[PDB]
From Swiss-Prot:
It is an enzyme of class 2 (transferase). Keywords: Acetylation, ATP-binding, Endoplasmic reticulum, Lipid droplet, Nucleotide-binding, Transferase, Ubl conjugation pathway. The gene is Ube2g2. This is Ubiquitin-conjugating enzyme E2 G2. Residues 6-166 form the UBC core domain. The active site is at C91.
Length: 167
């Protein structure tokens, strides 16, 4: 399949771009060499946020039609963020293709596009981590607790990082 071969070329270009301009606190790549379409990502919580010191492993699955469609990303560890579904699915706009679920005119350079990258995706996840956005309530409770009882949110965030460190 030519589509898949072209997708592969693309993934290698991404992997190369990542490995040469490594991003702060992120380390991603194909889990196993036999399959370049399935990636693993270790995202460390942002330095001065409630997630600092946390180490959050995630899985990025790339479609055989990449870069025409976005990859799927989900955290392997436990999390409590307004933008992360209760089973780990990361819900940010950039991971949504034109014609999906939520929207918002303002989401132009926010929807998936062949002009994006795993760099911009990860870069965005980290940002999402530091400053949430219950405008994308993938997790009801967390969205509520963030805009209402932030007090306890920070408390739980700390437990979340501790759990991620096997404590």
């Amino acid at each position: 399949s030519h589509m898949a071969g072209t997708a592969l070329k693309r993934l290698m270009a991404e992997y190369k771009q990542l490995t040469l301009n490594p991003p702060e606190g992120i380390v991603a790549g194909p889990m196993n060499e036999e399959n370049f379409f399935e990636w693993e990502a270790l995202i460390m919580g942002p330095e001065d946020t409630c997630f600092e010191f946390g180490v959050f492993p995630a899985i990025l699955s790339f479609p055989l039609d990449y870069p025409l469609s976005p990859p799927k990303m989900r955290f392997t560890c436990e999390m409590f963020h307004p933008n992360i579904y209760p089973d780990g699915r990361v819900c940010i706009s950039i991971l949504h293709a034109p014609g999906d679920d939520p929207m918002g005119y303002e989401s132009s350079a926010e929807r998936w596009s062949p002009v994006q990258s795993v760099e911009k995706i990860l870069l965005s996840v980290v940002s999402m981590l530091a400053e949430p956005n219950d405008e994308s309530g993938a997790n009801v409770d967390a969205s509520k607790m963030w805009r209402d009882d932030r007090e306890q949110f920070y408390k739980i965030a700390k437990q979340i990082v501790q759990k991620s460190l096997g404590l």
